[PDB]
Automatic annotation (TrEMBL), chains A, B:
Secretion signal span: none
UniProt GO MF annotations: ATP binding; diphthine-ammonia ligase activity
Species of provenance: Pyrococcus furiosus (strain ATCC 43587 / DSM 3638 / JCM 8422 / Vc1)
Protein's UniProt keywords contain Nucleus: no
GO terms (BP aspect): protein histidyl modification to diphthamide
Domain of life: Archaea
Domain (Diphthamide synthase) ranges: 4-196
Residues engaged in binding AMP: 11, 13-14, 86
Keywords, in A-Z order: ATP-binding, Nucleotide-binding
InterPro entries referenced in this protein's UniProt entry, alphabetically: Diphthami_syn_dom (IPR002761), DPH6/MJ0570 (IPR030662), MJ0570 (IPR005237), MJ0570_ATP-bd (IPR022427), Rossmann-like_a/b/a_fold (IPR014729)
Membrane-spanning residues: none
Protein name: N-type ATP pyrophosphatase superfamily
Length: 214, 214
């Protein structure tokens, strides 16, 4: 029952879900990423979680796509007992997870919910988070490619207590990409990104792994 | 017993093994690629089989690494009955496959061996094969990035009946990458490659998928 697969899309919560699972003695046999044609090229920006999976040394399973049926199809081919998803999964995402899980007879392990507290915990845990998506007023394109720290957290809280932008970007406020965390054996360094409704998006063009102190 | 995983590294034989398996009514649940640090960047040249897996629509499992222990670890997490490998696997490769297979209690399905005949069959089946590796005298860097056809086959046979270079590159003579085959839903187009003992190597920098007639 310790054998599980983590739904990994690359952002702060997928990574927190991974850290949580490992710390709670779970046996993460696989990371699972679903790729939809809804978003074809050679750029690394297509295999970002693939870059993180190498930093982690953990096997990565990639599915392709009614995404519920495709997900269940992928997960059904794995020798696992449960599915690990972050406690910040979309209100809709949780429904799909619950549905496929039940139908497959799998457990839905999830971290047992204050935005501020959560965000602070990630920083204290050594999470290196970069903003790669933005879709909320009060967040100019300047936020793209920017890393979050005790400083950026303030600006988020200050922005929240004004434009009411979620502190944990819960709801599409902004997308993230984790460049480093305690479990990474290698750090991810962005060499070239270049930025593109107040909808922003950072397309990573050049990136590489760098060994950590260890 | 129909459920299997194909050891897919991207070349002509991995793809032939895949085609053979699908045609023989096997249920290919996953493609498995092992990535070793023995060969760190963002280039697509790292996720080439990932590009093919999208063209195929088949889930891809990627392992990281005694590669035998790592392979068995990956395959042990999949709900399969056997392993599919091409009949051209290295004389050593077959030993590892047999070892892990036996230890996991899995079947080792493999295509039931004339080089010329084999190479001709691939062309007749519509295989679009590009040379991305070279390590044999009589094969100048001009062969890198070159596509194989009834014409290139002759030059290979003519070269064989002289420098004794294997027709199926069996033994490290040359590495390949399949840009298209009947099972691909999309074709792979190389936009920018640039070439690098008579050891040659083609590093693909730009590539993309293009829809097929269907
Ligand atoms: N294939 C998937 N299906 C459903 N939910 C997913 C999938 N992949 C990732 N997630 C959820 O996405 C959340 C993380 O989003 P993020 O912080 O941007 O990486 C996690 O809490 C997961 O539960
Ligand atoms: N992870 C692996 N372990 C052992 N053999 C492999 C692995 N991946 C691919 N192969 C073998 O590599 C052969 C294909 O080489 P190629 O034609 O260059 O793609 C196949 O016949 C497979 O049996």
């Amino acid at each position: 029952l310790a054998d599980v697969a983590v739904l990994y899309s690359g952002g702060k919560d997928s990574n927190y879900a991974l850290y949580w699972a490992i710390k709670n003695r779970f046996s993460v046999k696989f990371l699972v990423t679903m790729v939809s044609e809804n978003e074809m090229y050679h750029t690394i920006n297509a295999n970002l979680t693939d870059l993180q999976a190498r930093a982690l040394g953990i096997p990565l399973v990639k599915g392709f796509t009614k995404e519920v049926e495709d997900l269940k199809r992928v997960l059904s081919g794995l020798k696992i007992q449960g599915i690990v998803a972050g406690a910040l999964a979309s209100k809709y995402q949780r429904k799909r997870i619950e549905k496929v899980a039940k139908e497959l007879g799998l457990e839905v392990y999830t971290p047992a919910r204050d935005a501020k507290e959560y965000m602070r915990e990630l920083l204290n845990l050594g999470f290196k988070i970069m903003v790669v998506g933005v879709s909320a007023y009060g967040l100019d394109e300047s936020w793209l490619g920017r890393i979050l720290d005790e400083s950026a957290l303030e600006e988020l809280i200050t922005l929240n207590e004004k434009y009411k932008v979620h502190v944990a970007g819960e709801g599409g406020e902004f997308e993230t990409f984790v460049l480093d965390m305690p479990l990474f054996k290698y750090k991810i360094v962005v060499d070239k990104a270049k930025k593109v409704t107040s909808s922003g998006k950072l397309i990573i063009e050049e990136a590489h792994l760098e060994s950590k102190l260890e």
